[PDB]
Swiss-Prot record, chain A:
Source organism per UniProt: Severe acute respiratory syndrome coronavirus 2
Residue window of the full protein shown: 971 to 1018 of 1273
Functional description taken from the UniProt entry: Subunit of the fusion protein that is processed upon entry into the host cell. Mediates fusion of the virion and cellular membranes by functioning as a class I viral fusion protein. Contains a viral fusion peptide that is unmasked after S2 cleavage. This cleavage can occur at the cell membrane by host TMPRSS2 or during endocytosis by host CSTL. In either case, this triggers an extensive and irreversible conformational change that leads to fusion of the viral envelope with the cellular cytoplasmic membrane, releasing viral genomic RNA into the host cell cytoplasm.
Stated name of the protein: Spike protein S2'
Length: 48, 48
């Protein structure tokens, strides 16, 4: 849902007050992806 | 009127009839970037 997938591109072209919310949306998405990855890795580690 | 604060700072200045809405966190402009600037992390009330 962010404007772009490039963190520096979001940093530029955007004033900091709304760059904060854009970066926050991107951080939430990437953190969810990392959590899903580590949970799947835990399942696979239990099986292994 | 239900909370205490460590200290209270009252800043007084005069601008045009316009840009009083511009005096706020963000909202880049001449007054924001060259005059009294309000931080994007603000916890005070502006009175006009």
């Amino acid at each position: 849902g962010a404007i772009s997938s490039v963190l520096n591109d979001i940093l530029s072209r955007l004033d900091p007050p709304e760059a904060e919310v854009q970066i926050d949306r991107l951080i939430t998405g990437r953190l969810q992806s990392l959590q899903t990855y580590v949970t799947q890795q835990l399942i696979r580690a239990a099986e292994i | 009127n239900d909370l205490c604060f460590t200290n209270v700072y009252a800043d007084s200045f005069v601008i045009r009839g316009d840009e009083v809405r511009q005096i706020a966190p963000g909202q880049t402009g001449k007054i924001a970037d060259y005059n009294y600037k309000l931080p994007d992390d603000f916890t005070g009330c502006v009175i006009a």
